[PDB]
Amino acid sequence: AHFEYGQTQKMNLFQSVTSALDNSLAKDPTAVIFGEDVAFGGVFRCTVGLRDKYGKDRVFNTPLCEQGIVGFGIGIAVTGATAIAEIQFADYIFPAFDQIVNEAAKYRYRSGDLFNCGSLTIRSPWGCVGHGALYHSQSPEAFFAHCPGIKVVIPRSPFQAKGLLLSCIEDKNPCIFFEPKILYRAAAEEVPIEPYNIPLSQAEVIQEGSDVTLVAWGTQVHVIREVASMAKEKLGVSCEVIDLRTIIPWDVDTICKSVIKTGRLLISHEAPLTGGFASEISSTVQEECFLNLEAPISRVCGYDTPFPHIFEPFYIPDKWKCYDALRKMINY
């Protein structure tokens, strides 16, 4: 491997997603869940038990057609009902790109708020998994970040996944929620059994620090947490570790406040460097924090290739790649 709310239970990240979906269908009689293979529980177990508990009209399989899954979900949402669509791997969200970018994101604007699909959420497994190669590993968030009118949210853990997914489901805008698949059955943590929300468009500073700011999302948050530890032990460097959580609209203020304090920024993500979301954060921080920058903002990202099978260990922006970049930046 490269990496206050009432009663809780240990849950891994697949279980936390089920818990959020269960809490949703319990409290919102309009809500339905659909997509390929969700009825028997899904290919990553995220919908286990829900059709037996809520009914076949509420948790059901569609034909194998992703542009149809999203257009159908938009249609449900136009009527005001909560529509929770699944796309089986984020790599297969592209057939639905026109329905997401040209239709869902623009629905409310283009109608003058006469119609909307705010009650749509699209959830999909995301990110590398050790051996997924080109079409089981992708992290498409930067493709969606350039589309005003959708929100894109990615959690780092089971507690975070359930509170951010419930926020997506209840938010009155169409949301894509990317579930890091390599964490589905990784370590459990305590997760409240009843519903709770974590705000969208809010980053989280998970460790305070004074020398450098590190920003990541998804599984890569754990990588940068470990880089922080390596930096403290080997270099005596204090790192502020931030999980961005929402890709758009993103929390510009929390990131800029951190960088005004530290004077340094390193952004990391599994997605390719060119056009990746680190470019937006970098260019923005450079505009707002220019006079504070002690060194150039560093992006440690996947290379600009498709995501390889046998070469995955050499492709990912692992802790050594991030640490080496950090070391050079500290020495700039």
Partner: peptide
């Protein structure tokens, strides 16, 4: 060149 998943 080892780039795709097995059976591709």
């Amino acid at each position: 060149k080892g780039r795709q998943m097995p059976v591709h």
